[PDB]
User: Fold this.
Amino acid sequence: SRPTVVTVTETPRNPGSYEVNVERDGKMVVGRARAGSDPGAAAAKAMQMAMEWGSPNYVILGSNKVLAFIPEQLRVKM
Amino acid sequence: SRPTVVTVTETPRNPGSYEVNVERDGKMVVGRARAGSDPGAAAAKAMQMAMEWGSPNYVILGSNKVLAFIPEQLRVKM
Amino acid sequence: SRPTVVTVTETPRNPGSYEVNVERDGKMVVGRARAGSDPGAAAAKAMQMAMEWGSPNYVILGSNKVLAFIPEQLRVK
Amino acid sequence: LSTASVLAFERKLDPSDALMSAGAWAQRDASQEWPAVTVREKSVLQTVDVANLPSDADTLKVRFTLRVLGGAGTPSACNDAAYRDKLLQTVATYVNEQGFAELARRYAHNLANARFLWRNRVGAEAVEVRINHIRQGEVARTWRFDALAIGLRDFKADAELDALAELIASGLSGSGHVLLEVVAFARIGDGQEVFPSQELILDKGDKKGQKSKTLYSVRDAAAIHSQKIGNALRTIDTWYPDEDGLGPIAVEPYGSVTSQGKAYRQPKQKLDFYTLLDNWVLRDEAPAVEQQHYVIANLIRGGVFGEAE
Amino acid sequence: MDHYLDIRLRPDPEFPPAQLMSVLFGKLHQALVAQGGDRIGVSFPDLDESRSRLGERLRIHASADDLRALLARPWLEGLRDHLQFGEPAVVPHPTPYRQVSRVQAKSNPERLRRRLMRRHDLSEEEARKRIPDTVARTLDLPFVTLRSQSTGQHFRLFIRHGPLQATAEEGGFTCYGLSKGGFVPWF
Assistant:
């Protein structure tokens, strides 16, 4: 598991609020940090956590409402 | 039966929604938790459950629309 | 990652204040610089950081309270 | 018989975030609309956050509030009633021997000399502390202290210091409701550098171009963390195994100055919080009159004290 | 001189010792410029020139009683808790030729490029090609933080204890600059 993995998941305890998890190399560096209250803030937080914490590769995972704000299959992988 | 097993399955009672199960060391840690209504949220929830639970090794199972978001066999197994 | 990326995130240690990150061509040029205490100043600083630090292909990310002060054609180059 | 698997104590001496403002001296009796100082960025190829007084202001003013809640021995959670009853009997025995008067006097001493001004007290010229007792939204009693005459090392005596210690003792006992407002004026200099609380961020990345040092702020106003104020006015502990000359340190289990790197009250010697507490509640051994002050101060601070079993 | 005042900093857990040495030196410089005396020597015992750290002691030299009382007050203005200074006692006289003086180094080539461009050799890019490079950047060991007063920034100060050849005693100025620029009797 070489590239830094960034995931954005929605909390089911109240809908419409997200969280982000980062893993660089075999260890978790960010655990359940508040992303936001809309898909736009979650996409912005995912791109911010991928800008830093990143080697020359990364990967972003999210739902099909959050991954619409990220440019289509261009800034999602490296 | 050493690594943590993460399974993502589609609910047949309404098509399009997914649920995740997590087992670690022969004990079912997470049973039928809601993943989402699209394959991207299912992939994000599966990678989050592989990051948090199952520290040394893990295996991620799921449908082919769900595993298309994870890089091919590089991050699925450890 | 060829288009320059400009993201505006709200700092969760005090709610209501924003911070902007700007990355151009693999390496970051602006990391966690202060914006205002309202979405108007944050959107204005995002536009200003979009003019500089990338002339072609900027991306502006942010909340729906921040991306409502700019027109819809000025969010993706 | 056995220490409980869960045991938690609430926080007495609950402070708030200290807010900073700037102004001119001989105006402290009307200082209620002074402008709050703000942090700024500065390039050095790194970017730092600095703070500075305005060029027309030479006096810093720090303001916060304080509460004392009482009921020190009662835990918030437990697992067996026997250990809780023995603990209540032990702390009741302590307060029936001597009320909270030594601890309250040291707390009023730490409020008198403005020790919560951490690094902006060193280059000070004159410091004045004002303390108000808020009863029904108004002022019921005012105390005004000189902080440079009241030193840091030794614990001197004063009439108003005894009055403030009586107020804090009545608050800690459980016979009144004490709300304090603390304001401190320090005469640093015309446009000098003030030191807000530095920030810790567990999400900041590693690649170059990132900010090297950011400061704390509350709605565009430079402030200090509340836990730094608590650690500032918790330094009352001086009865430890090291010789006299270093000074008093803060009340922590295995009392340790981590910035230096040393750790006094190691568990190899029998002078930490846990073993003295276990001997007090289980083997009916009071260590000394001095160690009871340390154990009760560590219970006023609070924590999570649970043995597995 | 025969009016030495040794100061031994009390160990404080909240503050590192050099962070208080900088404040002591700043107050000493500010209240030494403020007086009428011009040459007031300053020496740094407990020097420890093997691990690259400045000492915990400091002594003064002023050939008067009123001036040494003025400087006993001057370095002790407002603090009264961190110094823990001593009493002026009669000095011994080994005088092993040790002279303590300021030194200065150049580690910023961009200031040299600015001085080349905007003052004498009016150009645009000849400056960056000709002299500077990311090499030959100097260093000096004893550091003093020393925030400035008249619209300045945080700049270090480096000092040197000279040759300790015990052969004779050469007369020198007591102080050239803020604190010390000449020879002092060393113990």
